[PDB]
Design a protein around this ligand. Structure first.
Ligand SMILES: Cc1ccc(C(=O)N2CCN(C(=O)NCc3cccnc3)CC2)o1
Length: 119
């Protein structure tokens, strides 16, 4: 029922994501010299360094907000990919599965802790 525990749990999960080769495309912004049309397709860029920095700044109030930004990394990859078989998009899908598998208990625990707080 620790309503703060999500933050370290998210730091640890981000650490695991940064050890994962599948995250390499998603740890920094898209170089427009490499992908010149990227901002024609993607309105709101997001990467794992931005997520980590926002968490470390104390600018997430809840793991739900962190989860929204991580899911934006994946939806941006799906929207930008030219093919559902593209290397970088395929990496996004494995990393999304990994993330969702691990974030589910973080979200459940937080929400249960907030319900207990308000009981
Ligand atoms: C072809 C295709 C399908 C889906 C995607 C896609 O989701 N992105 C475009 C490419 N991305 C980057 O360039 N990351 C920045 C970067 C810069 C230097 C070193 N590592 C990473 C990630 C986002 O790209």
């Amino acid at each position: 029922y620790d309503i703060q525990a999500w933050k370290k749990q998210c730091e640890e999960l981000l650490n695991l994501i940064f050890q994962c080769e599948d995250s390499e495309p998603f740890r920094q912004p898209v170089d427009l010299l490499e992908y010149p049309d990227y901002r024609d397709i993607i309105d709101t860029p997001m990467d794992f360094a931005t997520v980590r920095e926002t968490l470390e700044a104390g600018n997430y109030e809840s793991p739900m907000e962190l989860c929204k930004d991580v899911r934006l990394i994946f939806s941006n990859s799906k929207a930008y990919t030219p093919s559902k078989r593209s290397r970088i998009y395929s990496m996004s899908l494995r990393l999304s599965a990994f993330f969702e598998e691990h974030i589910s208990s973080v979200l459940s625990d937080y929400k249960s802790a907030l319900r207990f707080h308000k009981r």
